[PDB]
Structures are given as structure tokens and as C-alpha cells.
A = this chain, B = another copy of it.
Amino acid sequence: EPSPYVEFDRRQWRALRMSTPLALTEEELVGLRGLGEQIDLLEVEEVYLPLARLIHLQVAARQRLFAATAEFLGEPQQNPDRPVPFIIGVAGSVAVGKSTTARVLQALLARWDHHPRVDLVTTDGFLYPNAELQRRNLMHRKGFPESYNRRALMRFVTSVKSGSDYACAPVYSHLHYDIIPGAEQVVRHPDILILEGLNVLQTGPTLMVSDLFDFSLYVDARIEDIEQWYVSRFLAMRTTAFADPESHFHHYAAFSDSQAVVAAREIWRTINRPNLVENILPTRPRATLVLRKDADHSINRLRLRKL
């Protein structure tokens, strides 16, 4: 039966790498990966290099599109020193590795032969402040679509892809578990813009940020493996992030393996899992490329949208 997708195993996919240069050291990859991630230069060579190739093949191809509409509208050319920004979305569950994935993707694309301006924005900074969340009785649905100012987010991405000289996004603090007063992330007409977050691929009654994506990525894995990673990582954070007295969750540092596991499973069950099942997973069908990870965080299978 005909299909919009085309599956791959790491073997089939690593061949499409061709002669793409690996411009990332071991020290660099390290500072890009998160606690728990297993990503190594090998995976970066057999998976991220092909992806980066495909993306650049499409950055140019995509420009042909806006160019047509430009020609149709009888308008000028485009300052080649300012084309239409290529927007990439990276979606996935909490703890599946998407943040690392987006950080690595930005590193590789920015180090491309001509040195493109590659900006990365996480939807964290678009969550509503804790105070505003409490007001809406949402302090327990942090990460759900409604916990974000999707309007500000949409204005942000629209602003950037429309050619603005610069746009601003709030900044979120994982240490304080809240939006930081007065903080700003300024993005100035980048060549590429990667947007990473839980529900970026979301679709709805209004034009949304996913409708502005020229390419999308969905980091996938089994719901139980992600729970495992989540829990495991919660325990690990007792000696890293929670160890810090300034941490909103410093109280967690003193938890025992047992009580920490229980606490982690509860947050997963009451928050992260529901959101994954109800909002995130339903968006997967639309991803240009899905990176499937095995229980060991290893990306061994990919699903690409040819249609």
C-alpha cells in the first residue's frame, strides 16, 4: 500500500551521509548533551550528518518557494544577505532527548561551509509565569498546551520568519522553576531557527507555529523507556541540580532512592505521561523525520516524510 513515509534502519540511513564533514569534537558534543544522554560522535556521524545534509538540500529548495510567491507578487529579489529564515521544530516527550537533539542539530548546521546564523529557541521561555499558572489553576499542567502563551510564541516565530530585524522571547529558569523577570533572548534575522519544545507540532483552530515549520523533528521512544529515563534522571539530579540550595526542588536532594522513585513515578503518571499521550504523540504523524530510540537511548530507526 502507498505511504507518505519511508522507514530506515541506522545502516540504510548512515549511507545517505555521503561525504558530509564531521565538524564537532568530543569536548564540544559533551557540552551539548544532557544528563542521561548516550549520544556519541558515532551516532552524530551515522544519524545527524545525513539529517544535516538533507536539511541543507531543502533550505535552498524551500527558498525557491517564497521566491515564486515573490515573483508572482511582482516584488523585488531578496537581499541574499537576508533570505526567508528556515524554521525547524523539534518535538518530543519530557526526557526523551529532544533538547540534546536540537542542541546538536544547531551545532552542526551552524558549522556549515558558509556559516549560517543558526538560532535555537526552546518553548520554555513561553510558559506562563508560576503566578499566572496558579491564577489559571495550571501549576499542575506545566507543559500542557494551555500552560504556554501560544500567542506570544506565534507572534515570535511569525516575527522572525517574516523578516524582522530582531524578535524577543522570555527566558525560563529551570533552577527557579519559573520565568525570569526582565530576561530576554534576542534573535536577529537568523538563516535558520530551531524551535524546541513539548507541543511545537501542535495544530488547531488558528494558524500555529507548526504551520510555519519548513522542517520538523520528533524524537521518539517507547513510553515505558521514557518513564525509565525520566525516573532515572530524577534520581541522578539529586546530586546535580537539586543539590544546589538555590534550587526550587532542593528538598528532593534528600530523598532516598525509594522515595525519589515514588515521587518521580507520580509526577510522570499525573503529568508528563498524560501530556505525552494526549498532546505530544498525536502530533508525531506530522513530523518530517522521526528519530526512534531504543531503550538504550540509541537512535536505530528513522521515519521520513517523503509526502
Contact = CB atoms under 8 A, between A and B. Distances in A.
Given A211-B286, A286-B211, A307-B161, A61 B58 contact: no
A62 interface: yes
Given A285-B206, A307-B162, A72 B4 contact: no
A185 B203 CA distance: 32
A151 to B, nearest CB: 11
A71 B57 CA distance: 8
A3 interface: yes
A248 to B, nearest CB: 34
Nearest to A154: B4
Interface in A73-115: 73-74
A286 B67 contact: no
Contacts of A72: 16, 53-54, 57
A3 B2 CA distance: 37
B16 A205 contact: no
A60 B204 CA distance: 30
Contacts of A18: 74
Contacts of A67: 61
Contacts of A306: 66, 69
A199 to B, nearest CB: 14
Contact of A57 (B69, B205, B282): B69
A16 B68 CA distance: 13
A158 B307 contact: yes
Interface of A: 1-4, 6, 15-16, 18, 53-54, 57-58, 60-62, 64-69, 71-74, 155, 158-159, 161-162, 164, 203-207, 211-212, 282, 285-286, 304, 306-307
**When A and B form their complex, which 3 residue pairs have the shortest distance between CB atoms, in order from nearest?**
A61-B68, A2-B162, A57-B68
